[PDB]
Amino acid sequence: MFDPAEKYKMDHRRRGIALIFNHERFFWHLTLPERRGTCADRDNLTRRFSDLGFEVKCFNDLKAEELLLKIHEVSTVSHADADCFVCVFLSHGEGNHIYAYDAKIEIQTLTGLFKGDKCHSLVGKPKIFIIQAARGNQTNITEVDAASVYTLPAGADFLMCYSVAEGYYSHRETVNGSWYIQDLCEMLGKYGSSLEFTELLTLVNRKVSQRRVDFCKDPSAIGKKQVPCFASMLTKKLHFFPKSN
Amino acid sequence: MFDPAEKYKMDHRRRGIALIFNHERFFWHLTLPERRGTCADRDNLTRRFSDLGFEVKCFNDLKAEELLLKIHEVSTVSHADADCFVCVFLSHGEGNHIYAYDAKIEIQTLTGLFKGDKCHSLVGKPKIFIIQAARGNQTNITEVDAASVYTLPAGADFLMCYSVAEGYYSHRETVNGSWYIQDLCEMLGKYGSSLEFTELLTLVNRKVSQRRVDFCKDPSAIGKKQVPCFASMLTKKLHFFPKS
Numbered sequence: 001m002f003d004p005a006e007k008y009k010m011d012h013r014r015r016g017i018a019l020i021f022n023h024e025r026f027f028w029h030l031t032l033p034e035r036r037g038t039c040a041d042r043d044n045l046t047r048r049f050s051d052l053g054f055e056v057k058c059f060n061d062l063k064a065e066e067l068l069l070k071i072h073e074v075s076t077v078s079h080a081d082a083d084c085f086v087c088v089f090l091s092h093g094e095g096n097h098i099y100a101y102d103a104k105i106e107i108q109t110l111t112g113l114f115k116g117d118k119c120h121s122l123v124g125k126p127k128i129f130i131i132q133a134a135r136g137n138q139t140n141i142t143e144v145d146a147a148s149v150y151t152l153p154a155g156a157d158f159l160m161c162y163s164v165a166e167g168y169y170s171h172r173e174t175v176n177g178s179w180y181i182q183d184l185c186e187m188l189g190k191y192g193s194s195l196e197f198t199e200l201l202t203l204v205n206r207k208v209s210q211r212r213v214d215f216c217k218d219p220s221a222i223g224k225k226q227v228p229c230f231a232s233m234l235t236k237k238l239h240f241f242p243k244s245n
Numbered sequence: 246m247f248d249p250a251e252k253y254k255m256d257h258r259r260r261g262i263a264l265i266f267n268h269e270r271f272f273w274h275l276t277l278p279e280r281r282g283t284c285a286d287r288d289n290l291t292r293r294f295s296d297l298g299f300e301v302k303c304f305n306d307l308k309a310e311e312l313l314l315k316i317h318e319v320s321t322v323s324h325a326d327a328d329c330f331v332c333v334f335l336s337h338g339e340g341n342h343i344y345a346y347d348a349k350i351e352i353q354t355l356t357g358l359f360k361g362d363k364c365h366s367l368v369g370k371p372k373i374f375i376i377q378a379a380r381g382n383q384t385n386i387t388e389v390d391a392a393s394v395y396t397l398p399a400g401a402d403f404l405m406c407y408s409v410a411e412g413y414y415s416h417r418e419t420v421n422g423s424w425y426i427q428d429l430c431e432m433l434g435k436y437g438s439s440l441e442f443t444e445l446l447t448l449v450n451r452k453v454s455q456r457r458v459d460f461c462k463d464p465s466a467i468g469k470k471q472v473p474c475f476a477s478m479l480t481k482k483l484h485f486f487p488k489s
């Protein structure tokens with residue numbers, strides 16, 4: 001009775017929550033550059049996830065204490081009547097860390113809040129983390145960052161989506177936002193409501209990888225290709241078909 | 246005109262090569278245990294990949310020099326007439342490394358041989374690495390290893406398939422072989438020729454994660470669940486439809 005086309009049950013009362021932690025500026029003593037264009041990423045994601053039925057909650061430039069407080073709140077609330085959970089980090093990072101305004105936080109302690117034991121109401125439901133984070137260097141310009149955040153998985157029924165893999169480069173337009181987020185949001189717009197979500201992330205991999213880097217205004221940006229990846233521990237096909245209003 | 250259902254071109258003369266590096270025993274001074282049951286993994290993979298049209302080349306207990314020589318040979322040969330490339334490591338590992346018989350090798354130097362620049366004849370073609378490697382701890386029994394190998398991606402058009410993620414445990418039956426390889430090989434057998442390959446790996450994630458660990462013969466094995474993962478940098482849908 002094992003079914004090769006089994007779908008996650010996506011017929012709960014609510015789609016669920018999408019958190020977006022948006023980080024544009026950092027405490028002076030961290031000496032991290034501003035992420036001009038991140039607000040376009042935040043707004044584009046808010047529209048696309050909202051249109052798929054998510055209750056989107058955005059937070060701008062939280063300090064570590066506030067960020068840990070919000071994400072613990074969301075993890076200890078009931079998801080019993082929700083299909084799934086989405087969490088987005090738009091920041092700088094290094095290895096297994098993301099930067100809040102004032103300090104780095106271990107990604108595993110954030111994903112850990114939504115694992116089986118700690119969040120019973122999300123057991124067997126998709127938990128999707130999207131991470132646009134790279135190394136902070138030091139009218140619509142393209143800024144380019146080295147990959148820095150480990151493309152780690154997170155546990156049963158987690159999907160971890162990364163803007164860039166080791167040895168590649170992350171691009172952000174200061175007005176239009178991140179290449180990865182622009183291409184993710186275009187694909188959510190056209191295909192989010194019909195295509196299997198990993199099939200859609202594969203389109204994003206193609207779109208981002210096909211962006212040409214041979215004729216760049218800045219000569220030092222030439223050859224710096226971007227290739228995203230995703231680490232799936234999903235156990236079923238994931239669709240975001242339109243819900244009953 | 247951008248196509249949301251675009252498939253990798255899988256209509257070349259040959260499917261391509263599948264390498265399987267099978268490591269059962271290790272140099273005494275490494276203090277690594279034998280991997281009893283790995284030969285079942287090697288044989289099960291050989292049958293399933295052969296049935297999908299791969300030219301399977303197996304190597305048993307190569308030392309670092311021999312392993313680097315074989316994999317460099319395969320990387321510098323023409324893949325122009327091939328659909329794709331598969332490479333399987335059945336060994337112990339730690340972090341960024343896999344064990345040959347005598348020493349550890351950086352996984353990135355092995356995958357790096359098949360990247361764009363270094364292997365022009367595989368550009369735009371799927372490069373699939375399958376890694377059954379965990380920490381060597383010091384009739385058909387179940388041995389259990391802590392996850393140890395980083396679940397890293399490689400580059401454009403690579404798919405990296407891992408038996409186990411951080412915090413989970415890898416299981417091997419000393420006769421029937423690894424849980425991950427048994428479930429992978431069952432799914433290749435039933436669905437390899439019809440299903441999209443990442444869809445099939447998702448079935449393997451479910452099969453392996455549903456294997457119960459509450460009533461184990463060894464009490465210290467209770468609660469040690471196994472969850473695999475894959476890191477995709479594929480740009481299109483990957484199918485292994487029967488060739489003609």
Ligand SMILES: Oc1cc(F)ccc1CNc1ncccc1-c1ccccn1
Pocket residue numbers: 147148149150151152153165166167395396397398
């Ligand atoms: O994936 C990236 C991305 C990068 F930007 C730079 C390096 C890597 C590869 N490292 C890993 N990838 C997956 C899981 C764990 C690690 C890891 C953990 C601890 C120490 C080293 N690596």
